[PDB]
Amino acid sequence: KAANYQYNYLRDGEQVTAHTTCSVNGVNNFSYNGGFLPTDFGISRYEV
Amino acid sequence: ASLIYRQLLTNSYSVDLYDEIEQIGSGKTQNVTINPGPFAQTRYAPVNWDHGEINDS
C-alpha cells in the first residue's frame, strides 16, 4: 500500500527537508489455500 | 532700436530658467536597454511518445 514518510538531512550545510511516498506496480499476486474447511488456513491473495 | 539684439544676447541666460521650466513640465519615460545574444534558439529535446505506465498484475 502507498506509504508516506518525511525526514531531513544535511547537504553542504543547508538543511534539506524531504517528503516521499513509496508504492509498487506490476506486483505479482500469489494465492494459497491450505484447506477448504472453516478451520483451515488460507490467504486469498498476497502480493510479491 | 539696435539695442534689441544686444539685449537679447546679454539676457540670453534666462533661457536656462526656461529650459528648467519646460523640463519640469514635460513628462518623462526611459529604457530598459535590450539584451543582444539570442544567437542560439533552443529546441525542446528528443521527445518520443509512448503509452503510460500500464498497471499489470
How many Å apart are CA A32 and CA A43, to the nearest integer? 5
Cα–Cα nearest to A8, from A47, B22, A16: A16
How many Å apart are CA A10 and CA A26, to the nearest integer? 34
Q: Is A35 on the interface with B (CB under 8 A)?
A: no
Tell me how many degrees the CA angle B21-B23-B29 measures, rounded to the nearest 5: 155
Instruction: Say whether B53 and A25 touch across the interface (CB within 8 A).
Output: yes
Question: Is the Cβ–Cβ distance between A42 and A30 less than 8 Å?
Answer: no
- Resolution reading in Å: 3.5
Q: 3-state DSSP call for residue A29? A: strand
Question: Is the Cβ–Cβ distance between A34 and A41 less than 8 Å?
Answer: yes
Contacts of A26 in chain B (CB under 8 A): 55-57
Write out the H or E segment, with its range, that includes residue B9: helix B3-11
Residue A16 vs residues A13, A21, A22, B49: alpha-carbon distances, Å: 9, 17, 19, 34
Contacts of A25 in chain B (CB under 8 A): 53, 55-56
Q: Classify the phi-psi angles of A17: left when phi > 0, otherwise alpha if psi is within -120 to 50, otherwise beta.
A: beta
Q: Is B56 on the interface with A (CB under 8 A)?
A: yes
Question: Is the Cβ–Cβ distance between B24 and B18 less than 8 Å?
Answer: no
